[PDB]
Scaffold this active site. Structure first.
Site, PDB file in Angstrom:
ATOM      1  N   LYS A 179       1.593  73.656  33.524  1.00  0.00           N
ATOM      2  CA  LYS A 179       2.754  73.640  34.259  1.00  0.00           C
ATOM      3  C   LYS A 179       2.755  73.205  35.709  1.00  0.00           C
ATOM      4  O   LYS A 179       1.297  73.103  36.141  1.00  0.00           O
ATOM      5  CB  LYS A 179       2.986  75.213  34.654  1.00  0.00           C
ATOM      6  CG  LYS A 179       4.207  75.593  35.254  1.00  0.00           C
ATOM      7  CD  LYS A 179       4.420  77.187  35.099  1.00  0.00           C
ATOM      8  CE  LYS A 179       5.482  77.534  36.135  1.00  0.00           C
ATOM      9  NZ  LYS A 179       5.736  79.029  35.956  1.00  0.00           N
TER      10      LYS A 179
ATOM     11  N   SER B  53       9.994  80.992  34.519  1.00  0.00           N
ATOM     12  CA  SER B  53       9.918  79.532  35.200  1.00  0.00           C
ATOM     13  C   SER B  53       9.192  78.343  34.572  1.00  0.00           C
ATOM     14  O   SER B  53       9.249  77.124  35.024  1.00  0.00           O
ATOM     15  CB  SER B  53       9.373  79.639  36.848  1.00  0.00           C
ATOM     16  OG  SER B  53       8.105  80.214  36.618  1.00  0.00           O
TER      17      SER B  53
ATOM     18  N   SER C 230       7.536  84.936  33.827  1.00  0.00           N
ATOM     19  CA  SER C 230       7.897  83.395  33.759  1.00  0.00           C
ATOM     20  C   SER C 230       7.123  82.851  32.575  1.00  0.00           C
ATOM     21  O   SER C 230       7.190  81.348  32.402  1.00  0.00           O
ATOM     22  CB  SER C 230       7.578  82.755  35.028  1.00  0.00           C
ATOM     23  OG  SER C 230       8.643  82.975  35.786  1.00  0.00           O
TER      24      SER C 230
END
Ligand code: GLN
EC number: 6.3.5.7
Lengths: 125, 450, 285
Positions: free
Chosen positions: B38, B116, B140
């Protein structure tokens, strides 16, 4: 408070349990500050006032606040001691970690800045 | 195959907007595993952008600890994945590179991936990588995993290092892992489940050993379903899939119990009090002075320092910063913020009261008549279209906040929680949740029924 | 007429390394190349985290004992938010809600301290450990050196116990001597190793605080100026007001959103730290 019920005996008890007439969280949660307040907030946020749609921020904040202000009515129900030898030991064992860039001059601390003046960071008045 | 792999990568990237940066030479104990990271986790070899103009070409001088540990285990990092900017959002639509598109559907459908960790989930669903690292502050990792029909594990708070994991809300932020393979996921977790003295919140070696010493044989296993989460409007297909899974479990001889945990109902208002406040605080450093984007002309405007540079924050980030600063101002702090912290303590206490496993952080004794695991839906909704998600959010923030109704309590209480799919390529999931620190139980349970 | 005056004294600790990072706390800051003694954390790089230097605890223990302060069973660091070029995090870590110690005092005597009173004690409100900021040089562009950022400070806050101006000088002098005697600081006002803010009020009127005092002579004079200046008054001095100093006269001159740090562990000292540090104290006067 929290409570555990009796063990389910079969899958139809679970189907009936899931079909009980009980509020959803959606149902439980039921899914404005002055313009001067918002201006103060923009300032604290280091955000520009110019171009800011004040009433729109007023409106969004109003809804944000009524959502979290639900807490107003919720009642509230109701570490290892550092010792002397450990204090001294920790002090004795502290050291500079290269993985933290802690050794002086081990990396160019200003080398990521878009602007600089020699080895100084710069801010424009 | 190699040629076929690169071509697949280029295709899915172009159609689904998954990575923010890719290895120049892709695919060239975890030896040979390929991972995506990420883009809020810093890396030496790639920019770390946080999907933000603020950090659009930021190059960290150092690797996050989790990145270093993976590299040391022989993992190859394919690239950095797109995300909701600075971790703020539940749909994967807030990014300077545009939204991520869910690869479970044709890209023309413009279905949301969830957020997210949007790109992370997408890169796993496409079989681009063996596993992905994401972050989970309020759901997330679990929510996008759910929407990609893959495993999404959020370990207990503090197990995996947050050194180099860019701060969103530190009391909630957790590094998580996504994969299609429970075996790979466990190997990754074992590799990353380590004390790091660089991280003042890293679970100590001493507490890890205490946790291990508390493990007992459990026979039979006792599983709870949570009253307060058992009555939402669920997607078509859910009840059949859910009831099939519970029936499978019951036929294995484990015991299933109804449990009421009333505090879970207030978790969203708690979260949106605490988290925006931390966010505002943690984003106070961004000024373009030492790193990142900087306004070419002005460091100040309208008597507000750093305003020109900081105006390049995404719109959702600004909203949250504004809310967080409100929450921290003196009078609101003494009211909502203090109350939210106390209720969060109540929540942790309620969970402690129903789990057999002791909580070593609160020194709870464990309830011998309690439970080993909870099973809870991951989401009450199917992925909609990006437009629909964006339309709904515009109407009210509450409409977006509700997306994390099932995931936020485990974030607030730091509980290990794994979303697992119920049906191949279906954006519906369940969480298996254990007491704080009881990660191996969650993982072994999931492995056992896989 | 009667003066009721209080002090806020920030003192740089001479620990080997900094407060929340093990980067070097330099004693030669004036000759050092800028941004040389700076870790990833000092520059507030994304993903960096504070880790408390335990030597600052030791130094604060020594000061607390010397003052007769009560060490707090639990202390913590809070974030004080504001934007400035010399504050890379956008906040300062300091002990606002739960200070390291509370109470304590300093004794002054005619025999030893040249005071009119045979004996006069100045009470201490609290004692806080906090981060220093960087140094700014104004040349318009301002140059920022973060060598001093994250250097440990102890802030000492007194009760409004000062009545004479001779007391203020004697207090600052002994406090300077004290911190030097404890080997926790150079206590030098000229270098900024020690910084003194003042709060005062005449005849139970509004409290006024004086900022930017570079040396002891300027503090004494600002106090003397402000005392006589205030006597002459008188609708303007009803509410608190922060003033400055200009060598000749005193001229006129934000929600910090204090939040307990969510990452740093509490300071929870065992009772034996008190007796332990006690044995390591130098002979006090
Ligand atoms: C992840 O975690 C994001 C959680 C939640 N949607 C938020 O914006 O904070």
């Amino acid at each position: 408070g929290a409570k555990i019920g009796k063990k389910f005996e079969n899958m139809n008890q679970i189907r009936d349990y899931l079909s009980r007439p009980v509020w959803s969280v959606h149902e439980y949660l039921g899914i404005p500050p002055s313009a001067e307040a918002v201006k103060k907030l923009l300032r604290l946020s280091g955000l520009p006032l110019e171009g800011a749609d004040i009433k729109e921020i007023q409106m969004r904040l109003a809804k944000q606040l009524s959502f979290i202000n639900k807490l107003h009515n919720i009642p509230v129900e109701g570490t290892k001691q550092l010792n002397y030898t450990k204090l001294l030991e920790g002090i004795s064992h502290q050291k500079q970690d290269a993985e933290l860039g802690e050794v002086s001059g081990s990396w160019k601390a200003t080398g990521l800045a878009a602007e600089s003046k020699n080895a100084y960071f710069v801010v424009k008045e | 195959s190699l040629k076929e792999s690169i071509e697949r990568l280029s295709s899915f990237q172009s159609k689904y907007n998954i990575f923010t940066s890719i290895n120049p030479s892709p695919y060239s104990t975890l030896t040979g595993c390929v991972a995506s990271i990420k883009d809020n986790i810093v890396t030496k070899d790639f920019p770390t952008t946080c999907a933000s103009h603020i950090l659009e070409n930021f190059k960290s001088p150092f690797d996050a600890t989790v990145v270093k540990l993976l590299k040391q285990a022989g993992v190859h990092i394919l690239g950095k994945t797109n995300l909701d900017e600075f971790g703020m959002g539940s749909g994967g639509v807030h990014s300077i590179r545009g939204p991520v598109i869910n690869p479970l559907y044709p890209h023309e459908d413009k279905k949301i991936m969830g957020g997210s960790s949007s790109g992370a989930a997408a890169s796993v669903a496409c079989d681009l990588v063996d596993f992905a690292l994401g972050t989970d502050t309020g759901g997330s990792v679990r929510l996008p995993a759910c929407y990609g029909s893959v495993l999404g594990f959020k370990p207990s708070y503090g197990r995996l290092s947050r050194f180099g994991v860019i701060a969103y809300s530190q009391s909630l932020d957790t590094v998580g892992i996504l994969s299609k393979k429970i075996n790979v996921l466990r190997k990754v977790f074992h590799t990353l489940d380590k004390y790091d003295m660089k991280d003042p919140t890293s679970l100590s070696v001493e507490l890890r050993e205490l946790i291990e010493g508390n493990k007992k044989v459990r026979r039979p296993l006792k599983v709870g379903i949570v009253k307060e989460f058992s009555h939402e409007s669920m997607p078509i297909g859910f009840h059949r899939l859910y009831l099939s899974l519970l029936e499978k479990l019951i036929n294995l001889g484990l015991e299933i119990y109804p449990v009421s945990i009333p505090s879970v109902k207030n978790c969203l208002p708690i979260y949106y009090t605490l988290s925006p406040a931390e966010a505002a605080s943690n984003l106070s450093r961004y000024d373009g002075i030492r790193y990142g984007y900087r306004d070419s002309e002005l460091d100040i405007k309208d008597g507000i320092l750093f305003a020109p540079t900081r105006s390049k924050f995404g719109t959702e980030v600004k909203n949250r910063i504004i809310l967080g600063n409100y929450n921290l101002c003196s009078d609101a702090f003494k009211n909502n913020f203090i109350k939210a912290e106390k209720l969060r303590v109540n929540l942790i206490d309620e969970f402690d009261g129903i789990f057999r496993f002791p909580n070593v952080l609160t020194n709870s004794k464990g309830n011998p008549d309690g439970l080993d695991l909870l099973i809870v839906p991951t989401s009450s909704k199917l992925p909609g279209s990006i437009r629909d998600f964006e339309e709904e959010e515009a109407k009210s923030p509450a409409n977006s906040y509700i997306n994390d109704v099932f995931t936020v309590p485990m974030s607030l209480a730091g509980l290990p929680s794994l979303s697992m799919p119920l049906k191949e390529k279906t954006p519906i999931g369940l969480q298996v949740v254990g007491q704080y620190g009881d990660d191996s139980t969650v993982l072994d349970f999931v492995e056992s029924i896989s | 007429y009667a003066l009721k005056c209080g002090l806020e004294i920030h003192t740089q600790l001479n620990t080997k390394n900094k407060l929340f990072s093990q980067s070097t706390n330099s004693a030669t800051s004036l000759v050092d190349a800028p941004n040389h003694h700076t870790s990833y954390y000092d520059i507030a790089l994304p993903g960096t985290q504070p880790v408390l230097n335990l030597e600052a605890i030791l130094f604060a223990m020594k000061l607390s004992l010397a003052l007769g302060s009560q060490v707090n069973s639990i202390s913590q660091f809070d974030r004080k938010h504001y934007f400035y070029g010399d504050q890379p995090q956008g906040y300062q870590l300091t002990q606002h809600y739960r200070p390291f110690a509370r109470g304590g005092k300093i004794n002054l005597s005619k025999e030893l301290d040249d005071i009119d009173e045979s004996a006069k004690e100045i009470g201490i409100l609290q004692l806080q450990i906090e981060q220093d900021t960087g140094k700014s040089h104004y040349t318009v562009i301002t140059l920022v050196d973060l060598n001093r950022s994250n250097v440990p400070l102890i802030e000492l806050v007194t009760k409004p116990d000062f009545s004479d101006i001779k007391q203020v000088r004697a207090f600052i002098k002994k406090y300077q001597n004290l911190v030097r005697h404890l080997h926790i600081s150079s206590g030098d006002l000229e270098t900024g190793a020690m910084r003194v803010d003042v709060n005062l009020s005449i005849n139970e009127y509004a409290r006024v605080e004086l900022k930017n005092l570079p040396n002891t002579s300027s503090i004494i004079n600002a106090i003397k100026y402000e005392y006589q200046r205030q006597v002459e008054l008188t609708s303007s001095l009803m509410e608190p007001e922060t003033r400055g100093w200009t060598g000749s006269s005193t001229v006129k001159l934000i929600d910090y959103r204090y939040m307990p740090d969510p990452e740093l562990p509490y300071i929870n000292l065992a009772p034996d730290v008190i007796s332990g540090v006690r044995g390591l104290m130098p002979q006090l006067p």
